[PDB]
Amino acid sequence: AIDENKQKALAAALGQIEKQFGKGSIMRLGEDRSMDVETISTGSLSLDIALGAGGLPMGRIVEIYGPESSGKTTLTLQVIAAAQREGKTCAFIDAEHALDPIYARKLGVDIDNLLCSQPDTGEQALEICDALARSGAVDVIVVDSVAALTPKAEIEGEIGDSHMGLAARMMSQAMRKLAGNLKQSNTLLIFINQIRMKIGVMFGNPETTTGGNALKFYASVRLDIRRIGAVKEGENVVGSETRVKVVKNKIAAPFKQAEFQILYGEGINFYGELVDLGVKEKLIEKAGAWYSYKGEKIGQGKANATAWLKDNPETAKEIEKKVRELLLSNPNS
Amino acid sequence: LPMGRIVEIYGPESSGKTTLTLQVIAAAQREGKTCAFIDAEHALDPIYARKLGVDIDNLLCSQPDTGEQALEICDALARSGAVDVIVVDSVAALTPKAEIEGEIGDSHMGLAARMMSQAMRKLAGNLKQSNTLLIFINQIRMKIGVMFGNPETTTGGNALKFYASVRLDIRRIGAVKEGENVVGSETRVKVVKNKIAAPFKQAEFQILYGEGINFYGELVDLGVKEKLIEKAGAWYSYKGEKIGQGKANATAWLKDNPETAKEIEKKVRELLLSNPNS
């Protein structure tokens, strides 16, 4: 009697809404397959575990920030490389004007299929993101530094001229327009960002990022990448020891961190991670500085152990399959 | 929260604004009420909602294209008299149609403020007649060229401040750790406007990731405050019996002694909730 009139008035309003605005304009959340979270590999296996869902979410915005020469571009090109290996189309908006296409090829990016723009203004760069997002043909877009997205008024102006909150305003407007378009297209958007200092502050952290407050809110994931040491062959510095902290996560629990090696010319050391993950999950035994798999001594030191797993791709397939089985927190299906 | 009214929840990024609204909807669904979620931000995970105790199969969801579409679905559902709670996730993401059709860089002076002002006029009356709660979530922005005031603002202009019957300011104030593993957030809500009762009271609670609000953690702190639980440094004791060392052990005790929990809840309600139910 009471419950019956409500069910009818609901059905009528759902009819009236779907009439006015189109068919999927309102529905029950259990029946919406568009609203399910789908991920893409980062290249790093330690980072796929730290993110909890097994990688970066499609249809969302992601921010990567950090200090100078910390691996922000290199990480972002390993995401594209792994995406192109699954027949996805990718775009690089290079606002910093500093992409070396030979390095991209050495990291395993298919140069010949990667779309690239070196745009004149910030407004031009963000209009090309909206055009590619609406198309539904591109799967991953990267925007290298938002620090470098100069508004048109600032490019036509003189050095010294004040433009109060202009880049902030442009980013606020861009997120409003993009968020919805990226979700309909199932397109991933990765913003790279530089660090700056905030002055006349209390005792917070003095580090900021460029481009205002909008992108913090709209980002589904935020990563903070840092160089924490050197990788040496005696004298020759051959790479960087790198730490990534998940500073915001809406698809799984945050404040997990990943540690891996970037080697100059190859990129992220995949077999290096697989050792450390093998040790942690008691599939590899560490006796001081001696690594042992099923009794058989694979090597002495991490480099020799890594070199062994290179030579035995059956053993490396076996351990990868096992670690994936165990340690992934939220496997989708 | 008052039925037939408008509520505003604002705060910084990942402070617990969406989590809190989903625990309201979960509670309302357990009293057989119908709820709706307008997701203008395009960032709801249905599996997280289910873990917080929402019935996913009876929760109406809209991912609207424009701000005017979003606010016309709110007006349609309000007039129906069928829906009891509506949540609109970010006001900041309610983009007007001129701005969507336009180019990036185009100025639309006071367009979103005007849209919001108009919506408040049309909604206020329809919600009261239907006895429908409307919760707006808002993001923070910064004012520039200001000395008189604090520099924090909210998006969408000045209408919503005036029409809101309750305004909540939610902030993360620390971590919850199991030694090393950060397992949750320590959270503070200030009641910044209130027409239903006296304002400026605050609430402190824990959000535990994949669980939601820590009920038993609050019940410990309220016990201590109302003298029903005895605290000695870091030692919590109910009627002599040492129920644990630290807040986490005490919380784990009240989980595995559910009769004691119901007895303490009943007394805390009797004392501090001075609006007895029908």
Added chain:
DNA sequence: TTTTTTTTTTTTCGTCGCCCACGCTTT
């Protein structure tokens, strides 16, 4: 029974949006 003639005068506002960036030893 015969046959139409010719215009007159305004009324009222509605609404914000956005940060940006260190500088420097002292014995």
Added chain:
DNA sequence: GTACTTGCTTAATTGAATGCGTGGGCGACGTAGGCTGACTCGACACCG
């Protein structure tokens, strides 16, 4: 074996890490018309 004093365990509380000092703006339309420049088009004068 039971009663009295101290060490350690685990947790939470409060202080301190600090050093002090700021100034900059610009954008429109619900609704209108006339002028100006720069753009486009298609055909003929001239040249190969």
Added chain:
DNA sequence: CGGTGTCGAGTCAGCCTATTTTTTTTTTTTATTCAATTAAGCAAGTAC
């Protein structure tokens, strides 16, 4: 006989057309990690 350059007519996007005011406000702010330090309960050591 076709291609290049020039001529004239027609059309799209931007912009410019001109007052005020007497000259205001806030009620307070945001925030963060590491260390020293302290205090009560259980177990260890001591005493009857």
